[PDB]
Design an enzyme around this catalytic site. Structure first.
Site, PDB file in Angstrom:
ATOM      1  N   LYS A 198      -0.474  18.529  10.278  1.00 42.77           N
ATOM      2  CA  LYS A 198       0.108  17.286  10.764  1.00 42.77           C
ATOM      3  C   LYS A 198       0.226  17.332  12.285  1.00 42.77           C
ATOM      4  CE  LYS A 198       4.536  16.100  10.524  1.00 42.77           C
ATOM      5  NZ  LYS A 198       5.854  16.073   9.878  1.00 42.77           N
TER       6      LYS A 198
ATOM      7  N   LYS B 166      13.722   8.446  -0.979  1.00 44.43           N
ATOM      8  CA  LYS B 166      13.662   9.869  -0.665  1.00 44.43           C
ATOM      9  C   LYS B 166      14.552  10.683  -1.609  1.00 44.43           C
ATOM     10  CE  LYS B 166      13.200   9.087   4.364  1.00 44.43           C
ATOM     11  NZ  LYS B 166      12.231  10.035   4.932  1.00 44.43           N
TER      12      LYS B 166
ATOM     13  N   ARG C 224       3.882   5.802  -2.987  1.00 43.88           N
ATOM     14  CA  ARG C 224       5.123   6.434  -3.397  1.00 43.88           C
ATOM     15  C   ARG C 224       5.137   6.557  -4.914  1.00 43.88           C
ATOM     16  NH1 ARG C 224       8.370   7.307   1.085  1.00 43.88           N
ATOM     17  NH2 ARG C 224      10.296   7.585  -0.113  1.00 43.88           N
TER      18      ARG C 224
ATOM     19  N   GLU D  72       0.794  -1.219   0.000  1.00 48.27           N
ATOM     20  CA  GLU D  72       0.000   0.000   0.000  1.00 48.27           C
ATOM     21  C   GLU D  72       0.838   1.286   0.000  1.00 48.27           C
ATOM     22  OE1 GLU D  72       0.113  -2.447   2.228  1.00 48.27           O
ATOM     23  OE2 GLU D  72      -1.601  -2.306   3.616  1.00 48.27           O
TER      24      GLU D  72
ATOM     25  N   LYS E 278      10.889  19.975   3.482  1.00 48.79           N
ATOM     26  CA  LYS E 278       9.587  19.540   3.951  1.00 48.79           C
ATOM     27  C   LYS E 278       9.001  20.577   4.895  1.00 48.79           C
ATOM     28  CE  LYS E 278       9.433  14.535   3.961  1.00 48.79           C
ATOM     29  NZ  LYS E 278       9.551  13.347   4.813  1.00 48.79           N
TER      30      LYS E 278
HETATM   31  O1  LIG Z   1       4.336  13.558   5.426  1.00 45.19           O
HETATM   32  P1  LIG Z   1       5.237  13.174   4.266  1.00 45.19           P
HETATM   33  O2  LIG Z   1       5.688  14.333   3.451  1.00 45.19           O
HETATM   34  O3  LIG Z   1       4.502  12.158   3.361  1.00 45.19           O
HETATM   35  O4  LIG Z   1       6.579  12.437   4.834  1.00 45.19           O
HETATM   36  C1  LIG Z   1       6.325  11.062   5.237  1.00 45.19           C
HETATM   37  C2  LIG Z   1       6.426  10.815   6.745  1.00 45.19           C
HETATM   38  O5  LIG Z   1       6.648  12.029   7.507  1.00 45.19           O
HETATM   39  P2  LIG Z   1       7.576  13.105   8.251  1.00 45.19           P
HETATM   40  O6  LIG Z   1       8.086  13.925   7.138  1.00 45.19           O
HETATM   41  O7  LIG Z   1       6.542  13.792   9.094  1.00 45.19           O
HETATM   42  O8  LIG Z   1       8.625  12.397   9.073  1.00 45.19           O
HETATM   43  C3  LIG Z   1       7.077   9.535   7.301  1.00 45.19           C
HETATM   44  O9  LIG Z   1       8.106   9.736   8.310  1.00 45.19           O
HETATM   45  P3  LIG Z   1       7.685   9.403   9.845  1.00 45.19           P
HETATM   46  O10 LIG Z   1       6.235   9.596  10.167  1.00 45.19           O
HETATM   47  O11 LIG Z   1       8.087   7.954  10.052  1.00 45.19           O
HETATM   48  O12 LIG Z   1       8.551  10.412  10.621  1.00 45.19           O
HETATM   49  C4  LIG Z   1       7.570   8.551   6.267  1.00 45.19           C
HETATM   50  O13 LIG Z   1       7.237   7.260   6.849  1.00 45.19           O
HETATM   51  P4  LIG Z   1       8.363   6.193   7.143  1.00 45.19           P
HETATM   52  O14 LIG Z   1       9.425   6.761   8.026  1.00 45.19           O
HETATM   53  O15 LIG Z   1       7.578   5.078   7.853  1.00 45.19           O
HETATM   54  O16 LIG Z   1       8.952   5.781   5.852  1.00 45.19           O
HETATM   55  C5  LIG Z   1       6.812   8.686   4.963  1.00 45.19           C
HETATM   56  O17 LIG Z   1       7.247   7.676   4.013  1.00 45.19           O
HETATM   57  P5  LIG Z   1       6.317   6.354   3.679  1.00 45.19           P
HETATM   58  O18 LIG Z   1       5.967   6.417   2.239  1.00 45.19           O
HETATM   59  O19 LIG Z   1       7.268   5.206   3.955  1.00 45.19           O
HETATM   60  O20 LIG Z   1       5.115   6.338   4.589  1.00 45.19           O
HETATM   61  C6  LIG Z   1       7.030  10.058   4.350  1.00 45.19           C
HETATM   62  O21 LIG Z   1       8.448  10.346   4.158  1.00 45.19           O
HETATM   63  P6  LIG Z   1       9.050  10.515   2.691  1.00 45.19           P
HETATM   64  O22 LIG Z   1       8.082  10.912   1.604  1.00 45.19           O
HETATM   65  O23 LIG Z   1      10.053  11.665   2.955  1.00 45.19           O
HETATM   66  O24 LIG Z   1       9.751   9.266   2.411  1.00 45.19           O
HETATM   67 ZN   LIG Z   2       0.925  -2.714   6.084  1.00 48.22          ZN
END
Ligand SMILES: O=P(O)(O)O[C@H]1[C@@H](OP(=O)(O)O)[C@@H](OP(=O)(O)O)[C@@H](OP(=O)(O)O)[C@@H](OP(=O)(O)O)[C@@H]1OP(=O)(O)O
Ligand SMILES: [Zn+2]
Ligand SMILES: [Cl-]
Length: 350
Positions: free
Chosen positions: A323, A286, A85, A80, A313
């Site tokens: 958020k 990323k 992504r 999912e 970000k």
């Molecule tokens: O809100 P987004 O722009 O979509 O960034 C998110 C998210 O948030 P943060 O930027 O607030 O940290 C997650 O990071 P965490 O909640 O864990 O801090 C990360 O989730 P994962 O760490 O579990 O990967 C997720 O990626 P995903 O597609 O895996 O849910 C994705 O970060 P990115 O788009 O920068 O990879």
């Molecule tokens: Zn899952």
């Protein structure tokens, strides 16, 4: 109620099935299949065109062990999340086209600098099984763990309530709940486009309307106090009639496959490493997004000042503040505290 009809859920599931077979060489070892599906209306009197935009598979994620710090490692390879992504990459590619002033694009301008998705296009999420976490917890309205934030266990397989093993990954149910508050697009894309919210979610195995309603939509039952263009999204929920079959036989694979519109190729990721099976970074990592962001920046007429991915970000002030309110609403309602990676994972540049 607010349930997608069986006929329309079968339509969505059928289109995902057809695209999957067109991509994968005759062999079904994937256990979790997800996709993002565009529903495109020509008029609102005729049936829409369905167009599968992204596919992800996978059931596992990385331990803290293999995590890199150049943004070249996938943290979460549940199908999912992988599908989302890929859909994000698609959004980027579309955003580029719109900036290079092309016509065949999903976006139009909104007269605030920021694009908005054309109103005849609706986004659906499909998953062949209920998402890990709260969406697989079956409880009547009378409950300890039902409604709690959960973290993925033992490289993905299992979720347990958040500590109320160092710095873990949130369950797919919690991430989808987040997408229904902040949009599916992420902080970065929100610099350029208005939040894109799911119109509907179609779920196969272990479906239960009430469980998925709580898990993915109405968990906090508070939030509100929202600032446009953010809101509590109320997607409809659906279930297809037939399914490829449970198959809890032996064990799941470590492979995670992805495809998204405009790629000629299916990329194969080792979920334990967070990278391709030839030891290279995924087109979904990323760092690949950060490349796309600067591509976008150079085509934009605005300037952007940030040292790192992290700082970029933080430019999305509306998204970040929604958020923060979301996380607080969850804690206040006793769903637990969100576990987000430490900032140093995102403090890279290029
Ligand atoms: O809100 P987004 O722009 O979509 O960034 C998110 C998210 O948030 P943060 O930027 O607030 O940290 C997650 O990071 P965490 O909640 O864990 O801090 C990360 O989730 P994962 O760490 O579990 O990967 C997720 O990626 P995903 O597609 O895996 O849910 C994705 O970060 P990115 O788009 O920068 O990879
Ligand atoms: Zn899952
Ligand atoms: Cl899988």
């Amino acid at each position: 109620k607010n349930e997608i009809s069986a006929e329309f859920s079968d339509s969505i599931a059928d289109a995902v099935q057809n695209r999957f077979a067109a991509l994968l060489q005759d062999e079904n070892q994937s256990k979790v299949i997800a996709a993002f599906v565009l529903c495109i209306y020509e008029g609102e009197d005729v049936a829409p065109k369905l167009k599968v935009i992204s596919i992800g598979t996978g059931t596992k994620c990385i331990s803290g062990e293999q995590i890199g710090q150049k943004g070249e490692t996938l943290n979460d390879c549940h199908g999912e999340i992988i599908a989302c992504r890929g859909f994000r990459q698609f959004l980027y590619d579309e955003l580029v086209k719109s900036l290079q002033k092309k016509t065949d694009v999903i976006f139009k301008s909104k007269g605030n600098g920021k694009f908005v998705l054309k109103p005849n296009i609706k986004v659906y999420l499909y998953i062949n099984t209920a998402p890990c976490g709260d969406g697989r917890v079956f409880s009547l309205h009378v409950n300890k763990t039902a409604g709690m934030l959960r973290t993925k266990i033992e490289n993905g397989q299992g979720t347990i309530p958040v500590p109320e093993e160092r710095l873990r990954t949130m369950s797919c149910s919690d991430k989808i709940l987040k997408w229904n508050v902040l949009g599916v697009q992420g902080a970065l894309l929100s610099l350029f486009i208005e939040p894109i919210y799911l119109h509907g979610i179609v779920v196969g195995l272990h479906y239960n309307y009430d469980t998925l309603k709580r898990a993915l939509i109405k968990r906090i039952a508070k939030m509100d106090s929202f600032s446009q263009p953010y809101q509590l999204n109320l997607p409809s929920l659906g279930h297809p009639s037939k399914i490829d079959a449970v198959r809890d036989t032996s064990k799941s694979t470590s492979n995670s496959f992805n495809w998204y519109y405009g790629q000629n190729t299916v990329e194969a990721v080792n979920s334990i490493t967070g990278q391709t099976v030839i030891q290279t970074p995924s087109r979904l990592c990323k760092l690949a997004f950060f490349d796309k962001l600067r591509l976008v920046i150079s085509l934009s007429s605005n300037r952007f000042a940030f040292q790192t991915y992290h700082d970029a970000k933080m430019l999305a002030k509306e998204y970040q503040s929604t958020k923060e309110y979301f996380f607080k609403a969850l804690s206040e309602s006793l769903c637990g505290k969100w576990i987000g990676k430490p900032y140093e994972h995102d403090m890279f540049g290029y």
